[PDB]
């Protein structure tokens, strides 16, 4: 639609005069079940979402797949848009297409402020997706150490079994992250849980890193 | 259907004889919704070939005896696509637009010899920016205004 270009390019007076001339344009969606809030959150505009959320657009408007705007602001890295969506009362544990939560995608961008805002509002630290994977599996899958640490500021678990039976320690050792493995082990990781491949975290680690893993377990 | 605007046209040309420009401001909401409605492609062509002659005929009456031309150039200069912003379905007509611009350059041709040196520079400096803002034309009037200005 035209409001997709208006909210995409950031036309201030064109969108203001367009909504003040026709209030239906705010509630109108395109063929992909995406309203102006999804385009203005995907673009990161503050004033446009302040006008749309000021008029009182439903914050829980999901698309065809189920992507809530809180995933767009969480993954977007825009702290102010998370302040606005959480200010309007967004669902901190909204279910998207693949059953994930905004914690996984805010963790993907390594945005600490968004994680504090979401987890402070009542987000589940151990929120599991369809594949039984939490934000620690993905943050550890890229190397977000401080994201896992601020996840541990909210008493998150470090032994979530993945769809293959892999704990966050398995993915930390698979990513060849030494400090992350030593920190997860030092903070309560289990080295005895095995996956579907029947491989312990010691065997998954190469270069004799399992000896210092279990060494730090006993030490 | 244009049968609703036809009575407003042939009745408006009879009722609009001596009234000032304020009645045209009263006609702005009467013609805004009249231009917004009428999704018919070939039927509303008469409505657009009559209403524009009503408003430009009122422009002729307003420009007949006394003319300040400031509010006149501000009306069209500030209101170009006001009726084209609410309509999401552009009817791709381009049938009365050539008669629109050709009639505007015809009235400006009747007002271009010697009337008043002040509004001609702002009207021409406006329409040469309308050349750039158009981007879609038969390239006849756009050259006409700039060559009849270049001759001056």
Q: Which of B81, B88, B89, B90 to mutate to test the interface with A (most CBs of A within 10 A)?
A: B88
What determination technique applies here?
A: cryo-EM
A/B interface, count of CB pairs below 8 Å: 7
Choose among A136, A137, A138, A141: nearest CA to A155.
A136
Asked if residues A140 and A180 have their Cβ atoms less than 8 Å apart, the reply is yes
Residue of B nearest to A19 (CA): B86
CA–CA gap between residue A135 and residue A197 (Å, rounded): 22
CA–CA gap between residue A99 and residue A101 (Å, rounded): 7
Asked if residues A122 and A92 have their Cβ atoms less than 8 Å apart, the reply is yes
A122 Cβ partners below 8 Å, 6+ apart? A92
The rounded radius of gyration (Å) of the Cα atoms in chain B is 16
Phi-psi region of B135 (alpha: psi -120 to 50; beta: other; left: phi over 0): left
B2-11 as b/e: b if 16+ CB within 10 A: beebeebbee
Asked if residues A30 and A4 have their Cβ atoms less than 8 Å apart, the reply is yes
Phi-psi region of B16 (alpha: psi -120 to 50; beta: other; left: phi over 0): beta
- Data resolution in angstroms: 5.7
Distance, CA of A204 to chain centre: 27
CA torsion through residues A158, A164, A170, A171, sign:
negative
Helices (H), chain B: 3-15, 22-36, 45-48, 51-62, 70-78, 96-110, 117-134, 141-151
CA torsion through residues B104, B110, B111, B113, sign:
positive
Tell me whether residue B66 is exposed, middle or buried, using C-beta atoms within 10 angstroms of its C-beta: 0 to 12, 13 to 18, 19 or more. exposed
Choose among A59, A72, A61: nearest CA to A34.
A61
Helices (H), chain A: 2-9, 12-21, 24-27, 36-43, 46-55, 69-76, 79-88, 102-108, 112-121, 135-142, 145-152, 168-174, 178-186, 201-204, 209-218
Looking at the complex, report in whole angstroms how far the Cα of residue A154 sits from the nearest Cα belonging to chain B: 49
CA–CA gap between residue A191 and residue A212 (Å, rounded): 12
Residues of chain A neighbouring B88 (CB-CB closer than 8 A): 1-2
CA–CA gap between residue A148 and residue A179 (Å, rounded): 12
CA–CA gap between residue B77 and residue B86 (Å, rounded): 19
CA–CA gap between residue B21 and residue B34 (Å, rounded): 19
Phi-psi region of B69 (alpha: psi -120 to 50; beta: other; left: phi over 0): left
CA–CA gap between residue B57 and residue B52 (Å, rounded): 8
Q: How many residues does chain A have?
A: 219
Phi-psi region of A44 (alpha: psi -120 to 50; beta: other; left: phi over 0): left
Choose among A196, A114, A123, A187: nearest CA to A157.
A187
B100 Cβ partners below 8 Å, 6+ apart? B52
Q: Which of B81, B86, B89, B90 to mutate to test the interface with A (most CBs of A within 10 A)?
A: B86
């Amino acid at each position: 639609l035209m409001v997709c270009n208006l909210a995409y390019s950031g036309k201030l007076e064109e969108l203001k005069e367009s909504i003040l001339a026709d209030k239906s344009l705010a509630t109108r969606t395109d063929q992909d079940s995406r309203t102006a809030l999804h385009w203005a959150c995907s673009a990161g505009h503050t004033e446009i979402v302040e006008f749309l959320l000021q008029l009182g657009v439903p914050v829980n408007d999901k698309d065809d797949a189920g992507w809530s705007p809180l995933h767009i602001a969480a993954s977007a890295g825009r702290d102010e848009i998370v302040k606005a969506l959480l200010g309007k009362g967004a669902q901190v544990n909204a279910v998207n297409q693949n059953g994930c939560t905004p914690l996984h995608y805010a963790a993907s961008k390594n945005r600490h402020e968004i994680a504090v805002m979401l987890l402070e509002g009542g987000a589940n630290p151990d929120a599991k997706d369809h594949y039984e994977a939490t934000a620690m599996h993905r943050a550890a899958a890229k190397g977000n150490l401080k994201m896992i640490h601020i996840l541990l500021y909210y008493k998150a678990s470090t032994n979530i079994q993945d769809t293959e039976g892999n704990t966050p320690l398995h993915l930390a050792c698979d990513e060849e992250r030494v400090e992350e493995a030593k920190l997860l082990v030092s903070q309560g990781a289990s080295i005895y849980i095995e996956n579907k491949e029947e491989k312990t975290p010691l065997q998954v680690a190469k270069g004799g890193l399992g000896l210092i893993l279990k060494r730090m377990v006993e030490g | 259907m244009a049968d609703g605007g036809s009575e407003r046209a042939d009745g408006r040309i009879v009722k609009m004889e001596v009234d000032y420009s304020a009645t045209v401001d009263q006609r702005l909401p009467e013609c805004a919704k009249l231009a917004k409605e009428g999704r018919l492609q070939e039927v509303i062509e008469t409505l657009l070939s009559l209403e524009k002659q009503t408003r430009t005929a009122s422009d002729m009456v307003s420009t007949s005896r006394i003319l300040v031309a400031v509010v006149k150039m501000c009306y069209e200069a500030k209101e170009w696509d006001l009726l084209n912003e609410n309509i999401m379905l552009l009817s791709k007509r381009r049938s009365q637009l050539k008669q629109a611009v050709a009639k505007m350059v015809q009235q400006c041709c009747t007002y271009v010899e010697e009337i008043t040196d002040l509004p001609i520079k702002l009207r021409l400096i406006d329409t040469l920016r309308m050349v750039t803002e158009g981007k879609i034309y038969v390239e006849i009037e756009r050259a006409r205004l700039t060559k009849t200005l270049a001759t001056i």
